Write an enzyme that holds these catalytic residues in place. Structure first.
Site, mmCIF file in Angstrom:
data_model
loop_
_atom_site.group_PDB
_atom_site.id
_atom_site.type_symbol
_atom_site.label_atom_id
_atom_site.label_comp_id
_atom_site.label_asym_id
_atom_site.label_seq_id
_atom_site.Cartn_x
_atom_site.Cartn_y
_atom_site.Cartn_z
ATOM 1 N N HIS A 92 0.811 -1.213 0.000
ATOM 2 C CA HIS A 92 0.000 0.000 0.000
ATOM 3 C C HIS A 92 0.846 1.265 0.000
ATOM 4 C CE1 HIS A 92 0.621 1.286 4.162
ATOM 5 N NE2 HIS A 92 0.133 0.165 4.665
ATOM 6 N N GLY B 105 2.858 5.992 10.129
ATOM 7 C CA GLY B 105 4.191 5.754 9.558
ATOM 8 C C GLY B 105 4.893 4.555 10.157
ATOM 9 N N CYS C 172 3.945 1.532 9.570
ATOM 10 C CA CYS C 172 3.845 0.483 8.560
ATOM 11 C C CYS C 172 5.219 0.033 8.101
ATOM 12 C CB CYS C 172 3.051 0.983 7.348
ATOM 13 S SG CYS C 172 1.662 1.997 7.759
HETATM 14 C C1 LIG Z 1 -3.248 2.791 2.050
HETATM 15 C C2 LIG Z 1 -4.150 2.308 3.180
HETATM 16 C C3 LIG Z 1 -4.199 0.757 3.198
HETATM 17 C C4 LIG Z 1 -5.545 2.913 3.080
HETATM 18 C C5 LIG Z 1 -3.504 2.798 4.481
HETATM 19 C C6 LIG Z 1 -3.602 4.294 4.813
HETATM 20 C C7 LIG Z 1 -2.968 4.819 6.099
HETATM 21 C C8 LIG Z 1 -2.237 3.849 7.015
HETATM 22 N N1 LIG Z 1 -1.654 4.438 8.222
HETATM 23 C C9 LIG Z 1 -0.310 5.054 8.183
HETATM 24 O O1 LIG Z 1 0.115 5.556 9.169
HETATM 25 C C10 LIG Z 1 0.559 5.071 6.907
HETATM 26 C C11 LIG Z 1 0.320 4.467 5.695
HETATM 27 N N2 LIG Z 1 1.305 4.760 4.889
HETATM 28 C C12 LIG Z 1 2.163 5.546 5.555
HETATM 29 N N3 LIG Z 1 1.680 5.730 6.796
HETATM 30 C C13 LIG Z 1 -2.510 4.491 9.416
HETATM 31 C C14 LIG Z 1 -3.774 3.686 9.167
HETATM 32 O O2 LIG Z 1 -3.761 2.500 9.160
HETATM 33 N N4 LIG Z 1 -5.041 4.387 8.959
HETATM 34 C C15 LIG Z 1 -6.228 3.560 8.711
HETATM 35 C C16 LIG Z 1 -7.472 4.336 9.171
HETATM 36 C C17 LIG Z 1 -8.527 4.439 8.069
HETATM 37 C C18 LIG Z 1 -8.741 3.108 7.349
HETATM 38 C C19 LIG Z 1 -7.474 2.610 6.641
HETATM 39 C C20 LIG Z 1 -6.185 3.220 7.212
HETATM 40 C C21 LIG Z 1 -1.887 3.898 10.651
HETATM 41 C C22 LIG Z 1 -1.124 2.622 10.560
HETATM 42 C C23 LIG Z 1 -0.562 2.083 11.817
HETATM 43 C C24 LIG Z 1 -0.748 2.796 13.147
HETATM 44 N N5 LIG Z 1 -1.511 4.064 13.215
HETATM 45 C C25 LIG Z 1 -2.093 4.626 11.970
HETATM 46 C C26 LIG Z 1 -2.120 2.349 6.686
HETATM 47 C C27 LIG Z 1 -2.772 1.824 5.397
#
Ligand SMILES: CC(C)(C)c1ccc(N(C(=O)c2c[nH]cn2)[C@@H](C(=O)NC2CCCCC2)c2cccnc2)cc1
Ligand SMILES: CC(C)(C)c1ccc(N(C(=O)c2c[nH]cn2)[C@@H](C(=O)NC2CCCCC2)c2cccnc2)cc1
Lengths: 301, 297
Positions: free
Chosen positions: A39, A141, A143
């Site tokens: 992702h 971040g 991930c």
């Molecule tokens: C692309 C996709 C799959 C929608 C996504 C988007 C954001 C992130 N999250 C990143 O932090 C992040 C992603 N890329 C860089 N940073 C955060 C995250 O899961 N929010 C979720 C809340 C709404 C539903 C999907 C995402 C996160 C991860 C871990 C701990 N706390 C917050 C993970 C996945």
């Protein structure tokens, strides 16, 4: 008795930063491949319904900036395996440990090295919940952070962090990109299912309590597997199986308390509460220590 | 919210095994010096009244067997600094990190790398109790395991483990060999003083619970500092000082809850308990997170 994580040095040496366009997260650098969530190629727009095969066909090698500390790694290839992106780089990680990729079962524990921008920030012991979520401490971040076990010089990677669920628990994959639990890597309304308590771990922890000072919860009685599971169901505890009972064998012998003996103790604890008492450091029944954890910790492995 | 430890790698590359006589424990190898508890030179009936100066004068360099993994390190000199032995060795540790030696105060947290026979067993987060002990997970041979913080790649060594006390808690020194608390490295009748809860840390953790979305324990009251302390001390809580109040200022400002308003909440929490509820996943008031740790996590 503390929740102990594995020493994390072997894993710290594998952590890198991966940036794709505007998004940054962590990657795992083993030999000449960097592993990170697919992702990372999703954009603040693609989030709702990414077509990952299409987004990846778009991308070229130069679309990914990989930094190991302060040295830029040149990406010479890219591919997807399930939900993990694999970036081929031109340099084998000279710090690559002996390692395996393993897939763990609910109720098994591992250590997590939480990272941000490719730099290790902290380490903690975690358990795979019965509902396949992780009750982790992960911020934005995080991930690409991984979970792992070490077995005498070999790092067994079992988890790579992908997402947070709305209850604040966490969802990820094995290192082959297969999700743990019924979760998908896009913006959706998904929720963890009703969690349950890991019964064989609570029993192990009670054995750890007895091994130390605390014996007040033991009694003279025994239960049956069937009778106890009737109580387990009422309290949303995982059912206890003959295999669990066998795994607890070493602790039953060491302590003189048989498993169904201890089940009687736990069954009493489920109904009557703890009557103001604590058991180790806790007013709650702890279920993130496996039988193996208890023996490894009480034996100084 | 996890009690998380610092990544242990920088400390792992410093752990060695030290053997003298029949006794083996851990040492910390920094540059060309191995630090370890001086009681490695104690004999089985030296344990009650050892004279370490007399015991040390009788040793030569080759009475110390230092092993870094598979390689033996040649001891070329030795001296005693308070309760730590300093063994000069042939070779500077190539894995020496940027480091400092710091002495910490009660209430401060740190990570412990528990080690046996010079090899790392596990890592966990710890606090120095007000009675100068450590509620650690240490078995026989853990001696010489160290406690540390890391800040911008610099390792702050603040604790070396020496001994177990009768209650199952642990005593040790800073890396200059000065004990924390009134303990001695000798088999005696000594026992830890009465312990108390680290009030400033519980308040930090309540602020952390509010920074996450949990406000259920708040109330509409306030308190003076003296009234707070008169109540809290009846539950064996450490007095809260003006320093502690200033230190919480940043968390107060981030959440909009005055420090003494949070004190009023704590007072009520002590009076009522949790009533079947949880705060940051715990059914007890947690005191091994500092104001600093809460901001970081
Ligand atoms: C692309 C996709 C799959 C929608 C996504 C988007 C954001 C992130 N999250 C990143 O932090 C992040 C992603 N890329 C860089 N940073 C955060 C995250 O899961 N929010 C979720 C809340 C709404 C539903 C999907 C995402 C996160 C991860 C871990 C701990 N706390 C917050 C993970 C996945
Ligand atoms: C010589 C002196 C100072 C009396 C001493 C003797 C033994 C040790 N203990 C070592 O295990 C050990 C010693 N040398 C290699 N290992 C243990 C210890 O503290 N107390 C015992 C002796 C002191 C009085 C009560 C119990 C220990 C156990 C678990 C965790 N931590 C340490 C420590 C100091």
């Amino acid at each position: 008795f503390r929740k102990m994580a594995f020493p994390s040095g072997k894993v710290e040496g594998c952590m890198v930063q991966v940036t794709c366009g505007t998004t940054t997260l962590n990657g795992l650098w083993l030999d000449d491949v960097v592993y990170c969530p697919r992702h990372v190629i999703c954009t603040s727009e693609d989030m709702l319904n990414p077509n990952y095969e299409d987004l990846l066909i778009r991308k070229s090698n130069h679309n990914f900036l990989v930094q190991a500390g302060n040295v830029q790694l040149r990406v010479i290839g890219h591919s997807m395996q399930n939900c993990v992106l694999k970036l081929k780089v031109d340099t084998a990680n000279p710090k690559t440990p002996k390692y395996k990729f393993v897939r763990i079962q609910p109720g098994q524990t591992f250590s997590v090295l939480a990272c941000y921008n490719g730099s290790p920030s902290g380490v903690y012991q975690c358990a795979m919940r019965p509902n396949f979520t992780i009750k982790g401490s992960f911020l934005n971040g995080s991930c690409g952070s991984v979970g792992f076990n070490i077995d005498y010089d070999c790092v067994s990677f079992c988890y790579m962090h992908h997402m947070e669920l709305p209850t604040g628990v966490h969802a990820g994959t094995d290192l082959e990109g297969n999700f743990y639990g019924p979760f998908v890597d896009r913006q959706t309304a998904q929720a963890a299912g009703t969690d349950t308590t890991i019964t064989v771990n609570v029993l192990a922890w009670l054995y750890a309590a007895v091994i130390n000072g605390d014996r007040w919860f033991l009694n003279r009685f025994t239960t049956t597997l069937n009778d106890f599971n009737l109580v387990a169901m009422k309290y949303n505890y995982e059912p206890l199986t003959q295999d669990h009972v066998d795994i607890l064998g070493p602790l039953s012998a060491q302590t003189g308390i048989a498993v169904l003996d201890m089940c009687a103790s736990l069954k009493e604890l489920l109904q009557n509460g703890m009557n103001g008492r604590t058991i180790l450091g806790s007013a709650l029944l702890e279920d993130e220590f496996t039988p193996f954890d208890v023996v490894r910790q009480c034996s100084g492995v």
